Design an enzyme around this catalytic site. Structure first.
Site, PDB file in Angstrom:
ATOM      1  N   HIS A 465       0.758  -1.091  -0.096  1.00 14.14           N
ATOM      2  CA  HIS A 465       0.039  -0.017  -0.002  1.00 14.14           C
ATOM      3  C   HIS A 465       0.966   1.101  -0.038  1.00 14.14           C
ATOM      4  O   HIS A 465       0.617   2.236  -0.614  1.00 14.14           O
ATOM      5  CB  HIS A 465      -0.849   0.080   1.220  1.00 14.14           C
ATOM      6  CG  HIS A 465      -1.960  -0.970   1.408  1.00 14.14           C
ATOM      7  ND1 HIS A 465      -3.154  -0.974   0.215  1.00 14.14           N
ATOM      8  CD2 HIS A 465      -2.557  -1.956   2.032  1.00 14.14           C
ATOM      9  CE1 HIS A 465      -3.964  -1.763   0.345  1.00 14.14           C
ATOM     10  NE2 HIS A 465      -3.567  -2.199   1.531  1.00 14.14           N
ATOM     11  N   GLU A 490      -7.161  -3.334  -2.934  1.00 14.12           N
ATOM     12  CA  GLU A 490      -6.228  -4.421  -2.104  1.00 14.12           C
ATOM     13  C   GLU A 490      -5.447  -5.216  -3.558  1.00 14.12           C
ATOM     14  O   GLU A 490      -5.061  -6.180  -3.036  1.00 14.12           O
ATOM     15  CB  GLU A 490      -7.126  -5.343  -1.321  1.00 14.12           C
ATOM     16  CG  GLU A 490      -7.769  -4.891  -0.128  1.00 14.12           C
ATOM     17  CD  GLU A 490      -6.576  -4.061   0.718  1.00 14.12           C
ATOM     18  OE1 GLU A 490      -5.468  -4.539   1.119  1.00 14.12           O
ATOM     19  OE2 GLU A 490      -6.973  -2.969   1.354  1.00 14.12           O
TER      20      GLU A 490
HETATM   21 ZN   LIG Z   1      -4.843  -3.521   2.739  1.00 11.08          ZN
END
Ligand SMILES: [Zn+2]
Length: 665
Positions: A465, A490
């Protein structure tokens, strides 16, 4: 300020006092509104790209940056006063945000700008900016009559409260049970000793995750697992069932007033899945492909139960009850791979995992990471790093690492975007900033911090991320960082997790903390081979929850508990316990991203396609593919649709073949 230095590009203050947080909030809201008031009064005929679009865009960048200094301390500060101030600030700012998004006057100016604007003259991202802005307004009903706009208000209002009430109940709940040492058989000495003891030879056990799961997974006493599962799935049964009964219908009405058939369709429009029928087709077909694997696992588990019930004189019912799944799945792990987690951790000293993780990301993405000497941080345990492009020297951004549990600190793993990598008024670019927040075991009894394998996996996930946040460069703040579709966020994270299940990568992330000998090839092969244990039932379980989610926002007249029970028997093959109400404890519904639970599984399919079809094919440390991923998937942030980026990277549409192959389907 040059794009080839970090000097002066990061002046976020992490030492503000409660009073300063309070003052800056007042000032940010007041001063920001003046800007929207100005745009909201421009005569429609005089609206231009410069006085309307550019002004809204500039203020969006300024606001977002100032706002992080005010809403982030609640998650990391050591001072309870500061944290409370931050929480209050976030609440006012969140309300203000809603206020501005409901501005009819501003909306009119943007709509009329697009009408008279020659989209071909501006950049693609700016077209998307107008497009998306008008779309959001319509999603708030700014194109509808005042009567409908108001009715949509008194509704989006309640649904907000009902959600805070739903969550409050679960969070506040303090249900507890008492078991004897005998009733907690098979539970480790460390577990029991951490339990409070009563005026009897009994131990106190709460329903919070730290107590619930170790018991459902290790307690050899079926009757105990049973009562624990019953109490756990009946929490706030009445209060929350009643909340869900008002909430789901409210979501139906609001969707209609806005012109959508169901709430699910309202939600799904902004995701790469686009529609309800698409999500249903995704889930339905996946559970079909998994049916045979679920039957085999279920068959295997059932044989373990029958065998144990004999070796223990326990009665047998020939079925896998809800309070039996966790236990036997744990048994399955132990019988098929038996990986000593507590032994393996000794090979992952945090120093080594950290150096390896960074070394790996540097090489793969063509970047250089340098630790900032005397950095301004919120806690002395935090380190700051500067990220430069290896080739050009360009300073993309900086990231902080906050690795240990701490009083008052967010207790779950996450990546916080603190500064967007978007363009500033002068055309220079703002340096991107991220904070990696996780809670890894601290050093104890003379031993360094030792990470379990799943923690190394979490480390790579969160860092996935962080790279997204830092490599993303867009013209507009609202499309920067990780601002991509919710069922796409994600993708960068789950794909990077694959590296901790790669034999050679693992070699770079481990070394015994003592003498430093490597993990034996025997252990490594065992470790990676164990990745998919129980995948059949685990995945089917996530599909069931995904189906319940879609159902609660597709037909707001059905009984939650019944819908849950229906899918349990049909998809997982494990019945929901009669009398319980799982949905009533499903925190995901009320607050959060209801209607989006399928997103995680949806993302994993996609990330698996990129990992196998490209990295596996070319070598997972191949810089070519690595740079393609960075440039085609990370760099554009949310300035492009998820599916388009995937296609650019794959040079074809994505599909689930790779995902299915992994499971052996
Ligand atoms: Zn995540």
């Amino acid at each position: 300020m040059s794009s080839y230095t970090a000097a002066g590009r990061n002046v976020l203050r992490w030492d503000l006092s409660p009073e300063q947080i309070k003052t800056r909030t007042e000032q940010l809201i007041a001063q920001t509104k003046q800007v929207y008031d100005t745009v909201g009064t421009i005569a429609l005929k005089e609206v231009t790209y410069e006085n309307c679009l550019q002004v809204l865009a500039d203020i969006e960048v300024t606001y977002i940056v100032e706002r992080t200094m005010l809403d982030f301390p609640q998650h990391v500060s050591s001072d309870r006063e500061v944290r409370a101030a931050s929480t209050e600030a976030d609440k006012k700012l969140s309300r203000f945000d809603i206020e501005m998004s409901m501005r009819e006057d501003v909306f009119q100016r943007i709509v009329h700008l697009q009408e008279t604007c020659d989209l071909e003259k501006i950049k693609p991202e700016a077209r998307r900016y107008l497009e998306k802005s008008i779309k959001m307004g319509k999603r708030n009903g700014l194109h509808l009559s005042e009567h409908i706009r108001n009715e949509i208000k008194s509704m989006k209002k309640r649904m907000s409260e009902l959600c805070i009430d739903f969550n409050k109940n679960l969070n506040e709940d303090d249900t507890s049970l008492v078991f004897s040492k005998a009733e907690l058989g098979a539970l480790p000495d460390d577990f029991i000793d951490s339990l409070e003891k009563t005026d009897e030879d009994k131990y106190k056990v709460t329903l919070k995750y730290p107590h619930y799961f170790p018991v459902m997974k290790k307690c050899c006493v079926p009757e105990t697992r049973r009562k624990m599962e019953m109490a756990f799935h009946t929490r706030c049964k009445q209060e929350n069932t009643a909340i869900l009964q008002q909430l789901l219908p409210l979501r139906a009405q609001v969707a209609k007033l806005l012109g959508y058939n169901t709430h699910a369709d309202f939600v799904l429009e902004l995701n790469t899945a686009k529609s309800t029928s698409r999500v249903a087709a995704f889930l339905d077909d996946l559970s079909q492909k998994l049916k045979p694997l679920g039957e085999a696992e279920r068959e295997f588990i059932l044989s373990l139960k029958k065998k144990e019930c004999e070796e223990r004189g326990f009665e047998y019912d020939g079925k896998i009850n809800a309070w039996d799944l966790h236990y036997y799945m744990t048994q399955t792990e132990e019988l098929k791979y038996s990986v000593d987690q507590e032994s393996l951790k000794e090979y992952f000293p945090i120093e080594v995992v950290t150096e390896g993780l960074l070394s790996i990301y540097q090489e793969l993405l063509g970047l250089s990471f340098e630790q900032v000497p005397d950095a301004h941080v919120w806690n002395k345990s935090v380190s700051l790093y500067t990220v430069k492009d290896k080739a050009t020297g360009e300073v993309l951004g900086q990231f902080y690492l906050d690795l240990y549990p701490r009083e008052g600190k967010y207790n779950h793993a996450a990546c916080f975007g603190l500064q967007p990598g978007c363009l500033l008024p002068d055309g220079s670019r703002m340096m991107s900033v991220a904070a990696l927040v996780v809670n890894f075991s601290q050093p104890v009894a003379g031993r360094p911090s030792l990470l379990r394998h799943d923690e190394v996996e979490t480390y790579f996930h969160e860092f996935g991320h962080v790279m997204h946040q830092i490599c993303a460069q867009t013209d507009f703040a609202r499309f920067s960082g990780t601002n991509v579709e919710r069922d796409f966020v994600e993708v960068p994270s789950q794909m990077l997790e694959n590296w901790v299940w790669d034999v050679d990568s693992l070699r770079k992330l481990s070394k015994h903390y003592k003498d430093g000998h490597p993990i034996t090839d025997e252990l490594l092969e065992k470790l990676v081979a164990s990745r998919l244990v129980n995948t059949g039932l685990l995945t089917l379980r996530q599909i069931v929850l995904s189906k319940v989610d879609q159902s609660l926002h597709t037909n707001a007249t059905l009984d939650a508990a019944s819908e849950y029970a229906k899918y349990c028997t049909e998809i997982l093959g494990v019945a929901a316990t009669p009398g319980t109400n799982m949905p009533a404890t499903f925190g995901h519904l009320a607050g959060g991203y209801d209607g989006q639970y399928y997103g995680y599984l949806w993302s994993e399919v996609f990330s698996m396609d990129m990992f196998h079809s490209c990295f596996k094919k070319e070598g997972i440390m191949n810089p070519e593919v690595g740079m393609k991923y960075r440039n085609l998937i990370l760099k554009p942030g949310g300035s492009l649709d998820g599916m388009d980026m995937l296609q650019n990277f794959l040079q074809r549409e994505p599909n689930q073949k790779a995902f299915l192959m992994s499971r052996g389907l």
